[model samples]
Target: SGAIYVGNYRVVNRHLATHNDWANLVWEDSSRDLLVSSTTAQGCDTIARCDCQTGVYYCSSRRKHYPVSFSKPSLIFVEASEYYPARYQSHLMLAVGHSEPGDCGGILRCQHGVVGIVSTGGNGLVGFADVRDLLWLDE
Candidate 1:
């Protein structure tokens, strides 16, 4: 006789990408921010900002991470080494969150200084993807 088996996996909360219309990307510190890169009339390079207090998000592509303009669909990868000071190696994935509609929000795989967008399978639900981390190892 043969038997069938079922399994489950859990996800993790890696990071967050808060949209900043007044500036660039703002870190958790509230004072430090990273400028997104891009400039186009069609909102190609726009950046999104999130209001933590009200749970609202806004998008604006006019901001640049370094004050320089770049092409559309630019790749942004997190420095692995930055994750661990002693290890000095880059991470394999980066987590992103969005507070707006019609935006791609979820975890991303970072390799060779580039971020690959991923899907969380949940739309219009704040922190839905974030909760995925709890079910990563569930079988």
Candidate 2:
């Protein structure tokens, strides 16, 4: 399979290579099972984490997570076009890294979006949000 880092690799001509998408998708790698450490919508510095060994995800920002799926959602977004910018901009993706992003097992409180608890579009990571939501949110 072709392995591609959606938001990792360096961009090339913003077309043949890659460019940061319109949406902010932040994430971290937990495990192969858990995959997505977290996906929250917030400032460029909103933080999240996942067990490099265990499959656990948690959100920090106040009411950021929206529990998209419960048991490993097979949900993927699809774009209609396949041209310059259109091909990669908000287009569907296949991950090469088994780090951030995974399963639908419970009342998954996805930090944002409606059908995903995977990547934060491109939001990036911080550490946590609040000092109070810190202890309870950490898994």
Candidate 3:
């Protein structure tokens, strides 16, 4: 009953933001682990699940898996593209990071729970679409 079909993909999970009138639809499906899990985000402590070539160049020589951890004003890397500069000031700001084309829509999580979803990144930082004020689509 919670299934949502967007194009050819079936979304197994869906949440509507508190600003339901805006219809901030956050959805995902348990499909591919390699694409959705942090197994590849090895070096960084707690960044997004998706990444780009920076991970290979910067993380390959690292000794520990989590060389760093999530911190206040943390460096959150990304691998997204087609950045749309917003006019509003309601945006989450973090430290320097890297991102490329095709790394959009990755999950950003903390020890407590998810923080938000990756929107885009550039100019020494990244942007996220806050999904914390969300409710089950069927709730």
Candidate 1 regions off by >4 Å? 1-33, 44-52, 56-139
Give the C-alpha lDDT of model 1: 0.21
Write candidate 1's Cα lDDT for 5-72 as tens digits: 11211122223332322233211211111112222222211112211111222212211121111112
How well does candidate 2 score on lDDT at residue 23?
36
Residue 65, candidate 1: Cα error in Å is: 26
What 10-residue stretch in candidate 1 is worst by lDDT? 1-10
TM-score of each: 0.16, 0.17, 0.37
- For model 2, the stretches where C-alpha displacement exceeds 4 angstroms are 1-44, 51-65, 70-77, 81-139
Give all candidate RMSDs, comma-separated.
19.4, 15.0, 12.8
Candidate 3 residue-wise lDDT, 11-125, digit = tens: 2212221233124334432111111111111222222322211211111122212211222322234442233223332323342455432333444455443444444446745
Ranking by lDDT: 3, 2, 1
Worst 10 residues of 3 by lDDT: 30-39
Q: lDDT tens digits, residues 1-139, model 2?
A: 0111212321111212112331322332221111212223322322223211112233333323331112222233323323212122221222222222111121122233111123322223211111111222223
Report the number of the highest-lDDT candidate.
Answer: 3
Model 1 clash number: 24
Scored by CA lDDT, what does every candidate get?
A: 0.21, 0.22, 0.31
